Amino acid sequence: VDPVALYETLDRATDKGPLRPAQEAVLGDWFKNYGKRDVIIKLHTGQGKTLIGLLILQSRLNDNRRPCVYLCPDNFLIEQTCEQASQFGIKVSTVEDDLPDDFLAGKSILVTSVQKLFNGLTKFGLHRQSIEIDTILMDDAHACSDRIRDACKIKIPKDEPAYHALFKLFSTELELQGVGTFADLENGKRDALLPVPYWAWMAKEGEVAAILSAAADKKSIKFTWPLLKDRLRLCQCIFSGAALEIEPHIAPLEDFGSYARAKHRIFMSATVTDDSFLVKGLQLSPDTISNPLTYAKETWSGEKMVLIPSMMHEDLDRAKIVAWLAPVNPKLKFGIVALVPSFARNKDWGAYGAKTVDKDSVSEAVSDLKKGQYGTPLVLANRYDGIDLPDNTCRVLVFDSRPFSENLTDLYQEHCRPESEATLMRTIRSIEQGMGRSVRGEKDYSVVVAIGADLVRTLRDVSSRRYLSSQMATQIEIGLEIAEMAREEIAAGKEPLAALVGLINQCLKRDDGWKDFYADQMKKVAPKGANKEILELYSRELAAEQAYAAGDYNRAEQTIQKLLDDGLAHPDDRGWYLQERARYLHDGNRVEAQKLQVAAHRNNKLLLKPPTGVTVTKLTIVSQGRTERIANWVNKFESYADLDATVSDILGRLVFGTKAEKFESALNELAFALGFAGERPDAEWKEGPDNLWALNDIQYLLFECKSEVDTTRSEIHKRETEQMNRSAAWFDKHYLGMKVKRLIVHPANKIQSAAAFTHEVDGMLDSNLKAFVRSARAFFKSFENQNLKDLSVLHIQGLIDAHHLSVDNLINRYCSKLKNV
């Protein structure tokens, strides 16, 4: 009954000692207070999660409270859990073919992956047929939440016939949400993304149901269709040239009666990771999130030296660190592990000799590093959960660039809501999960080198710093202080790479001064609770979604309206909730639905465009006061470090070979940065140019962004010329009387024989765009050692005249004449 007393009665191995104080305190707190239906245990990594879970579930089994089940997010953790249970003398069983009879009889703890429980053809049963479970414990609840989310999604790749069937079904309504993006979809670009709107989705529920039912024999639909077959009106559909994803807004956790009707639910997660995501992912009340079971005497655990070399010198960019750490070095006595956001960035690390591994070969490479194969650096792409690197297995973890999600839904919300709460919290959660893998013990120490301009912007931005955990924020601040001190050292004549190597040596050689400095500085961490406003916002969102799922549209609409009126929503994030009301009222009251959809499109133009009632508004700016706008935009920043981080992020993305979406967003941000006003009519107004800059009252810059085109291509295809002709026609239709410089951002100079331009269009080659980026970087570098809040207007005008960023300079200096073949 008592788990601390139960620990002594086990036939444990000889090398297993007594309970740690944190483990014993958590067990005592659990036995005293729960011996409430939901509970979250937050603790540091390496505290013995498996031991605590097995002890709690064995104690629950001892009271004839059966069955009790431990879930792992993956199969490696299944093997580790069963091995450790064999060490501790606790009998466990696994689901080989069918459910164990000992598990049903309540004789042993069931250890299973979260995929076995959460799937459409599960052996635990669905709806009323679900096999009853008393106590269920979840380890690493955020990874399990991600796996539960991925189990409820339909992803159909291009090569299946279902993708072409659904594309033929939805081509008419996908074309109205963007014309250039539709041409990218027809060519199969992975980066291309188009949503199917709600009005087309509920009106074509039967056809999509028939198409998906016709392809139930495929692997991608067989295990997901029974959950979604009777709730297609609640889903959303996103198309990309590699795959199409259909996902419900909230996961159907009510169908899983073994989990939803469970008598006790214990959740385990990291201390640094914010448990605000569990409101929607796992459908918890905020009371359990705001009241976790933690060790009272618990402090910071483990040693992390989070270095940011981009703060140290201008030469210490991402490329220098990549060229320094990637190539093989046989004299190293420890592993070097790099975390990159995609397989595209495996090229830069792997060109120097680093070992790049795919999804299936991560575990083999990690196990090889655990055996002492420290010669070759290891690169891991977009997978941080489930990886353990204790002690000598990794002493140099490298974090490359801002991590991005593989889900089309999250990419779409990143496209529409860049500065919202949820997107920033997801990115910060991914950053913290990736950064905490290198340290697993209370003694273990590591250097985490975080590079890439976008990652540093995420770590510096004032809106994004407030969501970081206090431990990780204080570690970043220690890195900032050491970076400033070593910057002063480099200003005294020290070589930058030499200073970085010296600091890494100070951490790795166990210097006493660094230990004293870390012990003194770390004392400032106050363990932050979950933010109550964000929890209340998510609770209202979940309540409205459940109200709409039950057929009560008016309750959901009033819930979203009360959410808007109480001020919990961000002022720039109003329009999303307006769209939510417009989607909830679509069946009930179509006129009010169209009114709120038009309101949502006016408030946030990146959202879905209704076919009627939207009028194109001319982007207008005044000629005078450009320098005042530049001064105000720079005046938003507190110090030169934030401005340099933001400018380096924006101008790093203006290179060929990057994604088209990132290039267009960076160009719009640079439009605002230079005192202009920019818009993206293909994404905002769903037709026309990819970017438009309002330089002054009468002059505009029109861009046709072709960033994905390889630099070695020497001809302009017919489809690109047709796209630029359509953009020019749209601008001549909606902006009569305005001068414009039509620019096509393309590496090629020559035009194909079958292709032609209807208007005068000039190209931006690679050298011209590089010169433009150099001019912008030299312009924003000139604000160094200047007072940001007292910028002189004449000084800014002089900098504009010096760096060739005037209106005529933008029109004429940064373009090249194209040649016809």
Q: By the criterion CB under 5 A, which residues form the site for Ca ion?
A: 180, 184, 660, 664, 690
Q: Are 156 and 164 in contact (CB under 8 A)?
A: no
DSSP state of 816: B
Of the pair 247, 664, the CB lying nearest Ca ion is at 664
Instruction: Measure the CA–CA gap between 610 and 116, rounded to whole angstroms.
Output: 42
Instruction: Measure the CA–CA gap between 534 and 203, rounded to whole angstroms.
Output: 34
DSSP state of 392: G
Q: What is the DSSP string of 495-518?
A: -HHHHHHHHHHHHHTT-HHHHHHH
Of the pair 146, 690, the CB lying nearest Ca ion is at 690
Instruction: Measure the CA–CA gap between 625 and 631, rounded to whole angstroms.
Output: 10
What is the CB neighbour count within 10 angstroms for residue 208?
Answer: 21
573: left (phi over 0), alpha (psi -120 to 50) or beta: alpha
Of the pair 594, 691, the CB lying nearest Ca ion is at 691
Q: Are 69 and 133 in contact (CB under 8 A)?
A: yes
Of the pair 60, 686, the CB lying nearest Ca ion is at 686
Closest approach, Cβ 742 to Ca ion, in A, equals: 13
Residue given tokens 């570690």 in the structure block: 475
Of the pair 184, 649, the CB lying nearest Ca ion is at 184
Q: What is the DSSP string of 751-800?
A: E-TT---SS-EEEE-HHHHHHHHHHHHHHHHTTTTS-GGG--HHHHHHHH
Look at residues 89, 221, 60, 213 and name the one whose alpha carbon lies nearest to residue 156. Answer: 221
Q: Are 560 and 581 in contact (CB under 8 A)?
A: yes
Helix (H) or strand (E) holding 136: strand 135-138
Q: Which residue is nearest to Ca ion (CB)?
A: 180
Bridge-partner residues for 451, per DSSP?
400
Closest approach, Cβ 690 to Ca ion, in A, equals: 4
Q: Are 430 and 384 in contact (CB under 8 A)?
A: yes
Closest approach, Cβ 430 to Ca ion, in A, equals: 25
Of the pair 180, 436, the CB lying nearest Ca ion is at 180
Q: What is the DSSP string of 347-388?
A: HHHHTTT-EE--STTHHHHHHHHHTT--SS-EEEES--TT--
Closest approach, Cβ 708 to Ca ion, in A, equals: 6
Q: Are 241 and 254 in contact (CB under 8 A)?
A: no
CA distances from 561 to 280, 533, 554, 579, 599 (A): 19, 16, 10, 11, 14
Of the pair 59, 723, the CB lying nearest Ca ion is at 723
Closest approach, Cβ 195 to Ca ion, in A, equals: 14
Closest approach, Cβ 415 to Ca ion, in A, equals: 10
Of the pair 420, 668, the CB lying nearest Ca ion is at 668
What is the CB neighbour count within 10 angstroms for residue 639?
Answer: 9
Q: Are 522 and 550 in contact (CB under 8 A)?
A: no
Closest approach, Cβ 469 to Ca ion, in A, equals: 35
The CB-based long-range contact list for 548-554 (8 Å cut-off, 24+ gap) reads 548/234, 548/584, 549/231, 549/234, 549/250, 553/584, 553/585, 553/587, 553/588, 554/588
Closest approach, Cβ 720 to Ca ion, in A, equals: 8
Q: Which spans in 110-264 are helix H?
A: 114-117, 141-151, 161-175, 180-187, 198-203, 205-214, 219-222, 225-228, 257-260
Of the pair 368, 708, the CB lying nearest Ca ion is at 708
Of the pair 356, 723, the CB lying nearest Ca ion is at 723
Instruction: Measure the CA–CA gap between 148 and 250, rounded to whole angstroms.
Output: 11
Of the pair 432, 720, the CB lying nearest Ca ion is at 720
Closest approach, Cβ 664 to Ca ion, in A, equals: 5
Q: Is 201 exposed, middle or buried (0-12, 13-18, 19+ CB in 10 A)?
A: buried
Of the pair 545, 684, the CB lying nearest Ca ion is at 684
Of the pair 461, 708, the CB lying nearest Ca ion is at 708
Look at residues 163, 410, 144 and name the one whose alpha carbon lies nearest to residue 256. Answer: 144
Of the pair 348, 722, the CB lying nearest Ca ion is at 722
Look at residues 742, 744, 746 and name the one whose alpha carbon lies nearest to residue 709. Answer: 746
